[PDB]
């Protein structure tokens, strides 16, 4: 039965039936990341904000004098 299906001419035994399935390639698939993979200094942020605000204050004073 299965000899008529998978067998080949001159097949000597049933143990010689080849099997071709969806199989992993030799050596297995490469590794994959699994776990979770993950800023600015608050002092620097505050310094920049303070500098910008102070420039705005200086502009405000200058424009107030002009007005």
């Amino acid at each position: 039965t299965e000899v008529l299906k998978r067998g080949f001419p001159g097949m000597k035994s049933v143990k010689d039936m080849p099997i071709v399935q969806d199989a992993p390639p030799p050596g297995g698939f490469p590794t994959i990341r699994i776990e979770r993979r993950l800023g600015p200094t608050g002092v620097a942020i505050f310094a920049g904000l303070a500098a910008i605000m102070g420039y705005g204050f200086y502009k405000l004073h200058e424009q107030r004098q002009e007005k």
Partner: protein
């Protein structure tokens, strides 16, 4: 088309009347046994195997003959003398069926030493059968011989019961494929399993008569069959590649 036992022919036979069926040879010797004495008849043979027997010797025998001889005589003595020995010499012998066609055959090892007796061939997993000698030499295809015997049995089966009727052709085709080598190793065990299936499961013993020769063939020459099976690959697998 045979009946089943029970009932027996003596209890119910022809036309429902008591009847005993006998062989020609058994009937013929009776007046001589009666005239010459059961004591004289018992003077020959071993225990429970007394008397003489007519022997038909055929095959590859220098002098084939139908001769009368004392029971329990060795095959080698019975064949070398009164039959001229094996064609090509005793060493050219391959196998011999000592009891016709329904009994298992014997190789050269078993044959050399065993006697022609009911209680000697039986223990050799064979049978005296009809005490008919068939002789095969080394140039003979034993597989072809057994296949032809199976074909004969297939043509001779009456087909009344299922197992024999349906398995004679199966056995013949198995043997025919074996002859060309178009078979596999496990299919030999499959054949033996089928022989076990038929044996002792039918209405009459003709199933046993067909199953037995292949059984002994396998048991004594499985090397030849496997060699043939592999050898077909040298003439069938060359085109498969």
């Amino acid at each position: 088309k045979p009946r089943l036992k029970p009932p027996f022919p003596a209890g119910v036979g022809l036309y429902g009347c008591p009847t005993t069926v006998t062989n020609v040879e058994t009937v013929a010797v009776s007046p001589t046994i009666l005239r010459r004495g059961p004591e004289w008849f018992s003077s020959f043979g071993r225990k429970n195997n007394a008397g003489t027997k007519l022997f038909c010797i055929s095959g590859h025998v220098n002098r084939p003959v139908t001769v009368e001889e004392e029971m329990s005589i060795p095959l080698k003595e019975l064949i070398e003398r009164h039959a001229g020995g094996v064609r090509g010499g005793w060493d050219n012998l391959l196998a011999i069926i000592p009891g016709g066609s329904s009994v298992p055959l014997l190789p050269k090892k078993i044959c050399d030493g065993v006697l022609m007796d009911f209680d000697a061939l039986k223990e050799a997993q064979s049978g005296l059968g009809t005490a008919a000698v068939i002789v095969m030499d080394k140039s003979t295809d034993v597989i072809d011989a057994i296949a032809r015997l199976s074909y004969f049995y297939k043509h001779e089966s009456c087909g009344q019961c299922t197992p024999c009727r349906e398995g004679t052709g199966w056995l013949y085709d198995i043997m025919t494929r074996m002859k060309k080598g178009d078979a596999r190793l496990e299919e030999i065990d499959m054949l033996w399993e089928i022989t076990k299936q038929i044996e002792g499961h039918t209405i009459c013993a003709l199933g046993d008569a067909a199953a037995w020769p292949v059984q002994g063939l396998i048991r004594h020459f499985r090397g030849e069959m496997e060699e043939r099976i592999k050898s077909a690959g040298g003439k069938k697998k060359l085109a498969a590649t």
